[PDB]
Amino acid sequence: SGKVVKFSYMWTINNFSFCREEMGEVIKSSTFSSGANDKLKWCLRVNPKGLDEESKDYLSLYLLLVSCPKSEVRAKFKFSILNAKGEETKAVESQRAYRFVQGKDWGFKKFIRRDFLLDEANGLLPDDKLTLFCEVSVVQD
């Protein structure tokens, strides 16, 4: 029917300050999906120490379409970090919809400054846990 499908996914990474990934290495989430009948599968991929030299001071975060879609997929997405109260903070939005094929990622190489994240005063790493939040809005042709 082409009805827009909206859904959210959240993922807690333990001991985030101790992650050994260096620049360009990736942490992968589990797959997730809507509650509709299409059953597109998605995942998040995060670069704890940045994608590349340009984003070396940042956490980099991407949404990837994992499964094989039956028709064209266009999606909007927004990433945020949950504080200890579960409140969304430091949100970054795609604004426009992007075309996804199987294996395609879209995201922000400069999602958040690593030094801002690691400062306990900002409350984004309670108990050294990083909880990432993604909302996806998808239309299928």
Binding site: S94, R96, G103, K104, D105, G107, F108
Partner: peptide, 7 residues
């Protein structure tokens, strides 16, 4: 704006 790591 968003970036991608593929063509």
């Amino acid at each position: 704006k968003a970036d991608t790591t593929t063509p």
